Ligand binder design. Sequence first.
Ligand SMILES: CC(C)CCC[C@@H](C)[C@H]1CC[C@H]2[C@@H]3CC=C4C[C@@H](OC(=O)CCC(=O)O)CC[C@]4(C)[C@H]3CC[C@]12C
Ligand SMILES: CC(C)CCC[C@@H](C)[C@H]1CC[C@H]2[C@@H]3CC=C4C[C@@H](OC(=O)CCC(=O)O)CC[C@]4(C)[C@H]3CC[C@]12C
Ligand SMILES: CC(C)CCC[C@@H](C)[C@H]1CC[C@H]2[C@@H]3CC=C4C[C@@H](OC(=O)CCC(=O)O)CC[C@]4(C)[C@H]3CC[C@]12C
Ligand SMILES: *[C@@H]1O[C@H](CO)[C@@H](O)[C@H](O)[C@H]1NC(C)=O
Lengths: 288, 243, 234, 153, 291
Amino acid sequence: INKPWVHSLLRICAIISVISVCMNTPMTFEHYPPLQYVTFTLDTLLMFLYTAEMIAKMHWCVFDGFMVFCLWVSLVLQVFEIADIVDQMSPWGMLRIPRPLIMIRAFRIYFRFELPRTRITNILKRSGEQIWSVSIFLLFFLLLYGILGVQMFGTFTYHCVVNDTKPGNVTWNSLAIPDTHCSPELEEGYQCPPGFKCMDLEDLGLSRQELGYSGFNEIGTSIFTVYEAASQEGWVFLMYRAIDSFPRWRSYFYFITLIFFLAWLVKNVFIAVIIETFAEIRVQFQQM
Amino acid sequence: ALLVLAQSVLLSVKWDVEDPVTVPLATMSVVFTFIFVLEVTMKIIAMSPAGFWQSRRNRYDLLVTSLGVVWVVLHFALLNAYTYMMGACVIVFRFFSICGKHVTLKMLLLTVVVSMYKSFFIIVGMFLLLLCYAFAGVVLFGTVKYGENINRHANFSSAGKAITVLFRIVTGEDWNKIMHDCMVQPPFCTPDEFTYWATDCGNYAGALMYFCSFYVIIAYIMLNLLVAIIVENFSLFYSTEED
Amino acid sequence: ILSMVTVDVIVAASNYYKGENFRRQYDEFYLAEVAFTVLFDLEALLKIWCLGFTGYISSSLHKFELLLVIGTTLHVYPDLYHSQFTYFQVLRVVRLIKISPALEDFVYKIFGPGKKLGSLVVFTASLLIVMSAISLQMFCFVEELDRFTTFPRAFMSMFQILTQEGWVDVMDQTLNAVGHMWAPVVAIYFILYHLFATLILLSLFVAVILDNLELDEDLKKLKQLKQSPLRLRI
Amino acid sequence: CFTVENADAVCNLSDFYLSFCNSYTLWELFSGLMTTCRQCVEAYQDYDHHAQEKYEEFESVLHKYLQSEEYSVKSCPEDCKIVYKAWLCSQYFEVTQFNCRKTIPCKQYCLEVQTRCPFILPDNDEVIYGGLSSFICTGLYETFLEPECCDVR
Amino acid sequence: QLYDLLGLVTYLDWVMIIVTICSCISMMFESPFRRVMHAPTLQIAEYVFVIFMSIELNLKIMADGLFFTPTAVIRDFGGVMDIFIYLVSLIFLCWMPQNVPAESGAQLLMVLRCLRPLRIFKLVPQMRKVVRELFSGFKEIFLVSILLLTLMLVFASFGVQLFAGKLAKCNDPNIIRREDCNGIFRINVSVSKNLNLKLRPGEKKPGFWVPRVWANPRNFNFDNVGNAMLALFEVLSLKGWVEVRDVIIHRVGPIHGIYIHVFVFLGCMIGLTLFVGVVIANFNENKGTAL
Ligand SMILES: CC(C)CCC[C@@H](C)[C@H]1CC[C@H]2[C@@H]3CC=C4C[C@@H](OC(=O)CCC(=O)O)CC[C@]4(C)[C@H]3CC[C@]12C
Ligand SMILES: CC(C)CCC[C@@H](C)[C@H]1CC[C@H]2[C@@H]3CC=C4C[C@@H](OC(=O)CCC(=O)O)CC[C@]4(C)[C@H]3CC[C@]12C
Ligand SMILES: CC(C)CCC[C@@H](C)[C@H]1CC[C@H]2[C@@H]3CC=C4C[C@@H](OC(=O)CCC(=O)O)CC[C@]4(C)[C@H]3CC[C@]12C
Ligand SMILES: *[C@@H]1O[C@H](CO)[C@@H](O)[C@H](O)[C@H]1NC(C)=O
């Protein structure tokens, strides 16, 4: 504990520990069985060292105590699973979920501030307040476009199916190529051509999982879809489904406004926030 | 504010004549309106009517309340789709009023609207560039054989289609697969010796120059202007406690 | 020397695909690369004989070029040719940066003091590693799911989520793998990770670059104080 | 002009066409490709049946392509079906045909398919095709062009 | 404000703006099957445009001059652009061909004719201001582009050297050797990406019979430097990069998965951020708050 060499040792041990927890995986041992004994060995050795630390600290530390507790638990579980009494594919591996955080210790030296930490805390408080405000902004817009989607866009489960399709017999061979959405309306949406007919697959008995999560059936799934679209990941395909299923103008207005407002401006507000955080760093320390 | 939010949550399910659940919820929306009417009555009876009118937010509230009252009156008489859509729109317009209630929300809304206003000319320039590219795309590729990602939806066969696919490409999604679709050469197509409208495949080098130029220009350069505008406006308006 | 660098990289890039019929471990491009690496070894040895080893090492550019010389001498070993060591062959192009002092000044301006961008890169890497190991230990046991069956795959998945490409597909396949009782919390984890990655970290990169282009406030005040025939010429 | 019906009755051979691959004649098959002749006729019939089945599969795939009348201004589904039929039949009977009036290399038909038949996107589930069409002929730096076939177009 | 707006530009400028808008609205109805060359209805707008442009230029030339005057109609890029547009329009009107071979001079002229809307930039002062502000930082944008080009040459040369011709795989997954890919096989056809229908035990997915070919992917390959650079440019956008990753990993072995990932870090995360930083810095400089 006294020697800086001890601190260097503890930091390299933290890196070794995160490497070890990255290696521990069932299919790793299925590919390289010997590593099973490697993972165990390092797991015990490092723990011994940290135990010493816990013993020597009696004469912020709660974090290290929690970490050595997690190492204990992981070593116990590894002993149990190398006995082969507990299936290696069992969920119990989740007991290792917090061990990777040990990486923080490797950088702890840089985390240490000896200057007037009050200033740093104030900066972080300002940034947190701003981020919370913009989060509320974003959530309000997401809810707005959610309810709008629920009202306008219904449920995307009508499809063109082969003329003689029957319930429960729904299968790949029953769909058009490529699969095209439709609308039962005679004037709105896409009209299934001869030899095909529009009908709701959900009625035929497909699950929501089989139909896919996206859609505007309820406020929750509506806002989920809105967030997905605002990520600019797959928005045009959703727009196409909506155009095929509903009046075109609704889809155009909705998605164009969603992309204009959420995907550019609101995201740029977080850039502005972080720029202001750096401006505050400039004003306060002038030395970063 | 809480009542406003609850009434907005009443729109969690699609209002539909067929759906029985719609009938109760519509009724549920009526009472709120009456409550809201009181909120107006209070505010107009505590101050002089002119005093109430002086605040623009009060004007907006009064307009929304009057619209809601009209909707209530109609709903009990017609009871058709029109009433339900009108009520949903009234509820939306009322929910949007929560911005004024909060402080930070109001600031951010002001920031966004002002940014939109001050970006008008830049957006016009983007539109003009997109329209030029639309015309050139209709000329070069207006009869391209359907491919991986050119289809009923993504098509250059008319200026509107071209504009929509160009806006998509501004969003970036799969621009490269459209570009490679427009590259299609023989033996994947039947070429024509006399007219470009009698063939079904596009221009290789034309596609490269077109799509690369459009993407670099719009996506890498122009949008950063709007980013800068947002930054400036945020600095201008948003301001928490100051030491 | 810069001309020879240019010719070398041009020749190396000209090793295009001709046909499966003829291709060998010994070919004209190999002899060219040998000649160029010999020439650069000669250049480095002479420069060291002039400046002395400590003098040579005294400057970052000479350390960089020494590293490249070592790498591209290993590169010509016939068992390592076209291995990963090929990176050292191509990095020679960076010598050409010295052709323009304007581009050099711009580079040193925009990359700014290395502490900032270096620490941001290290933070990004550490965060990716931590979150990848976390996701691995949550999902590695889940049947039917390959995306997290090993640490490299988990890292690829979290990096994909960072890029935002097909991230919704990774999410959908994970919610397929886990039972519907658990799909909501998994979705919440994925959403929070994507939100943090996309809104803060990338905004941190933008802010760092802008702060690198921005002048220092003391230089700003110094400048403020210091700063208080046409076409027809023919 | 006598579509082969019974395997025994058949055995000039230049007048007995096949049922499905009507374009070919028994004489051609005998040239390039009593009980022995019965075994040969039976083999031909079985090949014809297989070709018919696969052609039906292709037709059923194409029929669900709703963009059949829009994918090309120069090509129609009928030409696609015709050239795919000629391609499959040639695949099964790699023989030079003698008695037609206008003729082209058989291999060219493969190009004709990708010229005239729509762009069907293959499933990407176990292999990334990367926009590669389902029906392609020429490989990487493969010189495509041999026998001759009849210009049924 | 109405009086100030009406005085923004001269009456001739307003007339020309109106004419331009009308011309572009007419051009918006042009289509490959509704060509202006054969549709007289659309010819009116073109005629009006050309005539009014000629009158404008005739008036302005003899009031200012084309050259060697304190004020000239053509003294910056705006005048050059306007003259080029006018000449293109006039040549099109005089010629107005009946047949336009694909990839020919007629097509080139037609395409150039699409630049007409740009006139609004010059006519409207605010657009001119926007353009000038945007182009102020051209040097910085150029330097950033040179840096990205250098990165792309590095990675293109590496990719050509290592991957040249190795991406080619048999279209039939079952077959593993080049020599065994001959004849025909059965290929399934994509039905629906989003749907997750489960095939019945005794059913086969829709598909049909296609020949076996040893062909490279259509959308990218690394056979030569040009194709490598085009692929890397596509991967800068961050669209389709995961397909490139999977192709490289499966056809060239998993270690080269490093190659693509580092590029994404260097090119996309850092590199494209340079454009954003430069443009925001130039915007602040022009605004006047930089110092
Ligand atoms: C903290 C920083 C400095 C880097 C830490 C990264 C490590 C956690 C990485 C580096 C090497 C990686 C290993 C590299 C290779 C493999 C092989 C891989 O084996 C296979 O999946 C191949 C199976 C086969 O085809 O035979 C299993 C993961 C593993 C052990 C990786 C696990 C994670 C490791 C140890
Ligand atoms: C991050 C901020 C900006 C808000 C984003 C919303 C998420 C925090 C939550 C709230 C609503 C949640 C959704 C609410 C409802 C569902 C329905 C659920 O599907 C079912 O209810 C079917 C159950 C079954 O089939 O057994 C799957 C999860 C999902 C999409 C949830 C995923 C996570 C969501 C989008
Ligand atoms: C003062 C500055 C702005 C110079 C602008 C000059 C333009 C008016 C020039 C430059 C490009 C020229 C064009 C370049 C190429 C052609 C192709 C040429 O095509 C052909 O029809 C000839 C070959 C054939 O017909 O087979 C016809 C003239 C044209 C349109 C030229 C017309 C005049 C243009 C537009
Ligand atoms: C088509 O799908 C089946 C599963 O139904 C699969 O066995 C087969 O390999 C697929 N075809 C190809 C070419 O991969």
